[PDB]
Amino acid sequence: LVHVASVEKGRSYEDFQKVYNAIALKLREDDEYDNYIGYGPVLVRLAWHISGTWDKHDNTGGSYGGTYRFKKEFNDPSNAGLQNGFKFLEPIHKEFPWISSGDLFSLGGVTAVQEMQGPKIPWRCGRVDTPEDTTPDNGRLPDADKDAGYVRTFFQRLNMNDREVVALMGAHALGKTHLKNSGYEGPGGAANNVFTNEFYLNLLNEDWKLEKNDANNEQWDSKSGYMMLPTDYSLIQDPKYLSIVKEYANDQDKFFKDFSKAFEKLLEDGITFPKDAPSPFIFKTLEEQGL
Numbered sequence: 183l184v185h186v187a188s189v190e191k192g193r194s195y196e197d198f199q200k201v202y203n204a205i206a207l208k209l210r211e212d213d214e215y216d217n218y219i220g221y222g223p224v225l226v227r228l229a230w231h232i233s234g235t236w237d238k239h240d241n242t243g244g245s246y247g248g249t250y251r252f253k254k255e256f257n258d259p260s261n262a263g264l265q266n267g268f269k270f271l272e273p274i275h276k277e278f279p280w281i282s283s284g285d286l287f288s289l290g291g292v293t294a295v296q297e298m299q300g301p302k303i304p305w306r307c308g309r310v311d312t313p314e315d316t317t318p319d320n321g322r323l324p325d326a327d328k329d330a331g332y333v334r335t336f337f338q339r340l341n342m343n344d345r346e347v348v349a350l351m352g353a354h355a356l357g358k359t360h361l362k363n364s365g366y367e368g369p370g371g372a373a374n375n376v377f378t379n380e381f382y383l384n385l386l387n388e389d390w391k392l393e394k395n396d397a398n399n400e401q402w403d404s405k406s407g408y409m410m411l412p413t414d415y416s417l418i419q420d421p422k423y424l425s426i427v428k429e430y431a432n433d434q435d436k437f438f439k440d441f442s443k444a445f446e447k448l449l450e451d452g453i454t455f456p457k458d459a460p461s462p463f464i465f466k467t468l469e470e471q472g473l
Protein backbone atom coordinates (compact mmCIF):
# COMPACT_ATOMS: atom_id res chain seq x y z
CA LEU A 183 0.00 0.00 0.00
CA VAL A 184 1.51 3.36 -1.02
CA HIS A 185 0.00 6.60 0.18
CA VAL A 186 1.34 9.72 -1.40
CA ALA A 187 0.77 13.09 0.18
CA SER A 188 -1.06 15.50 -2.21
CA VAL A 189 -1.27 19.21 -1.12
CA GLU A 190 -4.85 20.54 -1.29
CA LYS A 191 -5.05 22.59 -4.53
CA GLY A 192 -3.25 25.86 -4.43
CA ARG A 193 -3.14 25.94 -0.62
CA SER A 194 -0.01 27.12 1.28
CA TYR A 195 1.08 28.02 4.89
CA GLU A 196 -1.32 30.94 5.32
CA ASP A 197 -4.40 28.81 4.58
CA PHE A 198 -3.57 26.21 7.21
CA GLN A 199 -2.61 28.90 9.75
CA LYS A 200 -6.18 30.20 9.21
CA VAL A 201 -7.58 26.71 10.02
CA TYR A 202 -5.22 26.50 13.09
CA ASN A 203 -6.47 29.90 14.36
CA ALA A 204 -10.08 28.82 13.88
CA ILE A 205 -9.61 25.65 16.02
CA ALA A 206 -7.60 27.64 18.62
CA LEU A 207 -10.22 30.38 18.84
CA LYS A 208 -12.96 27.83 19.38
CA LEU A 209 -10.81 26.03 22.08
CA ARG A 210 -10.78 29.34 23.98
CA GLU A 211 -14.50 29.94 23.41
CA ASP A 212 -15.91 26.50 24.30
CA ASP A 213 -14.14 26.29 27.69
CA GLU A 214 -16.89 24.76 29.80
CA TYR A 215 -16.66 21.29 28.26
CA ASP A 216 -15.95 18.37 30.69
CA ASN A 217 -16.15 20.50 33.83
CA TYR A 218 -13.99 23.23 32.49
CA ILE A 219 -11.15 21.05 31.18
CA GLY A 220 -12.13 22.20 27.69
CA TYR A 221 -11.70 20.35 24.35
CA GLY A 222 -7.90 20.19 24.06
CA PRO A 223 -7.25 16.72 25.68
CA VAL A 224 -10.04 14.90 23.66
CA LEU A 225 -8.61 16.50 20.49
CA VAL A 226 -5.08 15.16 21.10
CA ARG A 227 -6.71 11.75 21.89
CA LEU A 228 -8.64 11.90 18.56
CA ALA A 229 -5.41 12.63 16.61
CA TRP A 230 -3.69 9.67 18.36
CA HIS A 231 -6.58 7.17 17.69
CA ILE A 232 -6.90 8.03 13.93
CA SER A 233 -3.09 7.46 13.64
CA GLY A 234 -2.86 4.52 16.05
CA THR A 235 -4.60 2.15 13.60
CA TRP A 236 -1.51 2.02 11.41
CA ASP A 237 0.21 -1.25 10.74
CA LYS A 238 3.85 -1.03 9.53
CA HIS A 239 3.65 -4.46 7.88
CA ASP A 240 1.08 -3.66 5.16
CA ASN A 241 0.74 0.15 5.56
CA THR A 242 -3.00 -0.08 6.30
CA GLY A 243 -4.70 2.24 8.84
CA GLY A 244 -2.96 5.47 9.88
CA SER A 245 -3.96 9.11 9.60
CA TYR A 246 -3.81 9.46 5.76
CA GLY A 247 -7.31 8.34 4.75
CA GLY A 248 -9.48 10.17 7.31
CA THR A 249 -11.52 6.99 7.71
CA TYR A 250 -12.80 7.82 11.20
CA ARG A 251 -15.62 9.67 9.34
CA PHE A 252 -17.00 6.14 8.48
CA LYS A 253 -19.38 4.24 10.84
CA LYS A 254 -17.05 1.20 11.41
CA GLU A 255 -14.23 3.33 12.83
CA PHE A 256 -16.56 5.95 14.42
CA ASN A 257 -18.33 3.18 16.29
CA ASP A 258 -15.21 1.31 17.43
CA PRO A 259 -15.72 0.74 21.27
CA SER A 260 -12.12 1.96 21.71
CA ASN A 261 -13.12 5.39 20.31
CA ALA A 262 -16.01 5.94 22.76
CA GLY A 263 -16.15 9.58 23.80
CA LEU A 264 -14.25 10.84 20.69
CA GLN A 265 -17.58 11.85 19.03
CA ASN A 266 -17.20 15.01 21.16
CA GLY A 267 -13.92 15.92 19.44
CA PHE A 268 -15.55 15.22 15.99
CA LYS A 269 -18.56 17.46 16.71
CA PHE A 270 -16.14 20.22 17.89
CA LEU A 271 -14.28 20.07 14.57
CA GLU A 272 -17.39 19.79 12.35
CA PRO A 273 -18.10 23.61 12.38
CA ILE A 274 -14.50 24.29 11.30
CA HIS A 275 -14.74 21.77 8.40
CA LYS A 276 -17.90 23.50 7.24
CA GLU A 277 -15.93 26.78 7.26
CA PHE A 278 -12.87 25.34 5.41
CA PRO A 279 -14.43 22.61 3.22
CA TRP A 280 -11.23 22.32 1.16
CA ILE A 281 -9.10 20.63 3.94
CA SER A 282 -9.13 16.81 3.95
CA SER A 283 -10.43 14.85 6.99
CA GLY A 284 -7.02 13.28 7.89
CA ASP A 285 -5.45 16.71 7.82
CA LEU A 286 -8.16 18.37 9.92
CA PHE A 287 -8.12 15.54 12.61
CA SER A 288 -4.29 15.65 12.80
CA LEU A 289 -4.01 19.50 12.89
CA GLY A 290 -6.65 19.57 15.73
CA GLY A 291 -4.22 17.47 17.84
CA VAL A 292 -1.29 19.78 16.91
CA THR A 293 -3.32 22.89 17.73
CA ALA A 294 -4.51 21.57 21.12
CA VAL A 295 -0.96 20.71 22.31
CA GLN A 296 0.54 24.10 21.33
CA GLU A 297 -2.44 26.05 22.68
CA MET A 298 -2.17 24.12 26.03
CA GLN A 299 1.49 25.35 26.02
CA GLY A 300 3.13 22.26 24.85
CA PRO A 301 6.10 22.18 22.50
CA LYS A 302 5.70 23.30 18.81
CA ILE A 303 4.78 20.25 16.61
CA PRO A 304 6.00 20.48 12.88
CA TRP A 305 2.99 19.46 10.75
CA ARG A 306 2.81 18.49 7.11
CA CYS A 307 -0.19 18.73 4.73
CA GLY A 308 -1.48 16.39 2.09
CA ARG A 309 -3.52 13.56 3.52
CA VAL A 310 -6.22 12.50 1.07
CA ASP A 311 -9.65 11.06 1.91
CA THR A 312 -10.00 7.43 0.92
CA PRO A 313 -13.19 5.24 0.42
CA GLU A 314 -15.25 3.52 3.18
CA ASP A 315 -13.71 0.16 2.16
CA THR A 316 -10.24 1.39 3.22
CA THR A 317 -11.52 1.80 6.84
CA PRO A 318 -9.43 -0.45 9.19
CA ASP A 319 -11.32 -2.99 11.30
CA ASN A 320 -11.97 -2.51 15.03
CA GLY A 321 -9.39 -3.88 17.48
CA ARG A 322 -6.13 -2.11 16.48
CA LEU A 323 -6.02 0.21 19.43
CA PRO A 324 -4.46 -0.87 22.81
CA ASP A 325 -6.10 -2.32 25.91
CA ALA A 326 -5.54 -0.50 29.26
CA ASP A 327 -5.55 -3.45 31.59
CA LYS A 328 -2.24 -4.92 30.50
CA ASP A 329 1.46 -4.80 31.41
CA ALA A 330 4.80 -3.41 30.12
CA GLY A 331 5.53 -6.32 27.74
CA TYR A 332 2.11 -5.75 26.12
CA VAL A 333 2.77 -1.99 25.67
CA ARG A 334 6.25 -2.67 24.17
CA THR A 335 4.90 -5.29 21.81
CA PHE A 336 1.81 -3.31 20.75
CA PHE A 337 3.91 -0.22 19.88
CA GLN A 338 6.37 -2.18 17.74
CA ARG A 339 3.45 -2.45 15.23
CA LEU A 340 3.58 1.43 14.87
CA ASN A 341 7.35 1.20 15.14
CA MET A 342 7.88 3.19 18.11
CA ASN A 343 10.80 2.25 20.38
CA ASP A 344 10.96 2.51 24.22
CA ARG A 345 11.93 6.12 24.28
CA GLU A 346 9.21 7.11 21.82
CA VAL A 347 6.57 5.12 23.75
CA VAL A 348 7.49 6.76 27.12
CA ALA A 349 7.56 10.26 25.55
CA LEU A 350 4.12 9.65 23.92
CA MET A 351 2.53 8.39 27.23
CA GLY A 352 3.32 11.77 28.95
CA ALA A 353 0.14 13.01 27.14
CA HIS A 354 -1.86 11.06 29.77
CA ALA A 355 -1.18 14.03 32.15
CA LEU A 356 -3.96 15.68 30.07
CA GLY A 357 -7.72 15.32 30.61
CA LYS A 358 -9.08 12.30 32.45
CA THR A 359 -10.60 8.86 32.17
CA HIS A 360 -14.38 8.76 32.09
CA LEU A 361 -16.05 5.60 33.46
CA LYS A 362 -18.87 5.55 30.90
CA ASN A 363 -16.36 5.69 27.98
CA SER A 364 -13.66 3.30 29.15
CA GLY A 365 -14.54 1.67 32.52
CA TYR A 366 -11.83 3.77 34.22
CA GLU A 367 -12.34 6.96 36.25
CA GLY A 368 -10.33 10.00 37.34
CA PRO A 369 -7.56 12.49 36.36
CA GLY A 370 -3.81 11.81 36.58
CA GLY A 371 -2.76 15.13 38.02
CA ALA A 372 -3.66 18.66 38.99
CA ALA A 373 -2.71 20.48 35.72
CA ASN A 374 -4.83 18.49 33.31
CA ASN A 375 -5.30 21.05 30.53
CA VAL A 376 -1.81 22.56 30.57
CA PHE A 377 0.92 20.44 28.82
CA THR A 378 3.70 19.63 31.44
CA ASN A 379 5.92 16.62 32.49
CA GLU A 380 3.66 16.00 35.59
CA PHE A 381 2.69 12.46 34.46
CA TYR A 382 6.28 11.39 35.16
CA LEU A 383 6.52 13.33 38.42
CA ASN A 384 3.25 11.82 39.77
CA LEU A 385 4.18 8.30 38.74
CA LEU A 386 7.44 8.54 40.73
CA ASN A 387 6.22 10.68 43.70
CA GLU A 388 2.71 9.57 44.57
CA ASP A 389 1.67 6.79 46.84
CA TRP A 390 -0.23 4.46 44.51
CA LYS A 391 -2.87 1.98 45.67
CA LEU A 392 -4.35 -0.79 43.45
CA GLU A 393 -8.16 -0.46 43.81
CA LYS A 394 -11.31 -1.59 41.99
CA ASN A 395 -13.54 1.07 40.43
CA ASP A 396 -17.38 1.05 39.90
CA ALA A 397 -17.04 -0.60 36.48
CA ASN A 398 -15.17 -3.40 38.35
CA ASN A 399 -11.86 -2.65 36.78
CA GLU A 400 -8.59 -2.30 38.62
CA GLN A 401 -6.70 0.97 38.57
CA TRP A 402 -3.92 2.63 40.56
CA ASP A 403 -5.26 5.30 42.94
CA SER A 404 -3.52 7.94 45.07
CA LYS A 405 -4.40 9.89 48.24
CA SER A 406 -4.34 13.10 46.20
CA GLY A 407 -7.32 12.00 44.06
CA TYR A 408 -5.27 10.95 40.99
CA MET A 409 -5.42 7.68 39.14
CA MET A 410 -3.17 5.73 36.77
CA LEU A 411 -4.20 2.98 34.33
CA PRO A 412 -2.49 -0.52 34.60
CA THR A 413 -0.60 0.22 31.35
CA ASP A 414 0.45 3.63 32.78
CA TYR A 415 1.84 2.19 36.02
CA SER A 416 3.67 -0.36 33.82
CA LEU A 417 6.24 2.29 33.01
CA ILE A 418 7.71 2.25 36.51
CA GLN A 419 7.52 -1.60 36.67
CA ASP A 420 9.86 -2.17 33.73
CA PRO A 421 13.61 -1.20 34.21
CA LYS A 422 14.18 0.22 30.64
CA TYR A 423 10.97 2.31 30.81
CA LEU A 424 11.57 3.38 34.42
CA SER A 425 14.94 4.99 33.65
CA ILE A 426 13.44 7.08 30.77
CA VAL A 427 10.53 8.16 33.16
CA LYS A 428 13.18 9.45 35.56
CA GLU A 429 14.91 11.30 32.72
CA TYR A 430 11.68 13.12 31.81
CA ALA A 431 10.72 13.88 35.45
CA ASN A 432 14.18 15.47 35.77
CA ASP A 433 14.21 17.46 32.48
CA GLN A 434 11.01 19.04 31.07
CA ASP A 435 12.77 20.47 27.94
CA LYS A 436 14.06 16.97 26.86
CA PHE A 437 10.48 15.64 27.42
CA PHE A 438 9.03 18.46 25.20
CA LYS A 439 11.67 17.87 22.48
CA ASP A 440 11.14 14.09 22.39
CA PHE A 441 7.33 14.33 22.54
CA SER A 442 7.36 16.71 19.53
CA LYS A 443 9.37 14.26 17.41
CA ALA A 444 7.33 11.17 18.36
CA PHE A 445 3.90 12.87 17.95
CA GLU A 446 4.88 14.18 14.43
CA LYS A 447 6.18 10.69 13.56
CA LEU A 448 2.91 9.21 14.89
CA LEU A 449 0.87 11.55 12.72
CA GLU A 450 3.00 10.90 9.61
CA ASP A 451 3.31 7.08 9.69
CA GLY A 452 2.26 5.55 6.35
CA ILE A 453 2.54 8.73 4.27
CA THR A 454 4.99 9.18 1.42
CA PHE A 455 5.91 12.81 0.92
CA PRO A 456 7.35 13.63 -2.65
CA LYS A 457 10.64 15.70 -2.60
CA ASP A 458 8.91 18.71 -4.14
CA ALA A 459 6.36 18.67 -1.30
CA PRO A 460 6.55 21.75 1.05
CA SER A 461 8.50 21.68 4.28
CA PRO A 462 6.71 21.00 7.59
CA PHE A 463 4.82 24.03 8.84
CA ILE A 464 5.49 25.44 12.34
CA PHE A 465 2.27 27.34 13.32
CA LYS A 466 2.23 30.33 15.56
CA THR A 467 0.01 30.27 18.61
CA LEU A 468 -2.79 32.88 19.20
CA GLU A 469 -0.56 34.26 21.94
CA GLU A 470 2.45 34.72 19.63
CA GLN A 471 0.05 36.43 17.21
CA GLY A 472 -1.48 38.72 19.87
CA LEU A 473 -4.88 37.25 18.98
Ligand code: HEM
Nearest residue numbers: 223224227230263324325326350353357358359360363364
Ligand atom coordinates in the same frame (compact mmCIF):
# COMPACT_ATOMS: atom_id res chain seq x y z
C1 HEM B 1 -1.09 1.68 25.67
C2 HEM B 1 -1.44 3.06 25.37
C3 HEM B 1 -2.63 3.74 25.67
C4 HEM B 1 -3.84 3.27 26.24
C5 HEM B 1 -4.30 1.89 26.69
C6 HEM B 1 -4.59 4.41 26.43
C7 HEM B 1 -5.82 4.42 27.07
C8 HEM B 1 -6.61 5.50 27.47
C9 HEM B 1 -7.83 5.39 28.10
C10 HEM B 1 -8.51 4.12 28.54
C11 HEM B 1 -8.30 6.69 28.23
C12 HEM B 1 -9.62 7.14 28.84
C13 HEM B 1 -10.70 7.43 27.80
C14 HEM B 1 -11.96 7.95 28.44
O1 HEM B 1 -12.52 7.34 29.33
O2 HEM B 1 -12.44 9.01 28.08
C15 HEM B 1 -7.32 7.48 27.67
C16 HEM B 1 -7.39 8.89 27.50
C17 HEM B 1 -6.49 9.78 26.90
N1 HEM B 1 -5.41 9.37 26.25
FE1 HEM B 1 -4.70 7.43 26.11
N2 HEM B 1 -3.97 5.50 25.97
C18 HEM B 1 -2.78 5.11 25.50
C19 HEM B 1 -1.88 5.98 24.88
C20 HEM B 1 -2.05 7.34 24.57
C21 HEM B 1 -1.16 8.10 23.82
C22 HEM B 1 0.08 7.52 23.12
C23 HEM B 1 -1.78 9.38 23.73
C24 HEM B 1 -1.42 10.56 23.05
C25 HEM B 1 -0.14 10.89 22.42
C26 HEM B 1 -2.92 9.32 24.52
C27 HEM B 1 -3.72 10.40 24.88
C28 HEM B 1 -4.84 10.46 25.72
C29 HEM B 1 -5.47 11.62 26.16
C30 HEM B 1 -5.05 13.07 25.90
C31 HEM B 1 -6.54 11.18 26.92
C32 HEM B 1 -7.55 12.05 27.64
C33 HEM B 1 -8.89 12.14 26.92
C34 HEM B 1 -9.95 12.99 27.60
O3 HEM B 1 -9.67 13.76 28.51
O4 HEM B 1 -11.11 12.91 27.23
N3 HEM B 1 -3.13 8.06 24.93
N4 HEM B 1 -6.26 6.75 27.29
Ligand SMILES: c1ccc2c(c1)CCN2
Nearest residue numbers: 358359369370409410411
Ligand atom coordinates in the same frame (compact mmCIF):
# COMPACT_ATOMS: atom_id res chain seq x y z
C1 LIG C 1 -6.25 9.98 30.98
C2 LIG C 1 -6.06 8.62 30.72
C3 LIG C 1 -5.29 7.83 31.58
C4 LIG C 1 -4.75 8.48 32.68
C5 LIG C 1 -4.92 9.83 32.97
C6 LIG C 1 -5.69 10.60 32.10
C7 LIG C 1 -4.22 10.20 34.26
C8 LIG C 1 -3.26 9.02 34.49
N1 LIG C 1 -3.92 7.84 33.74
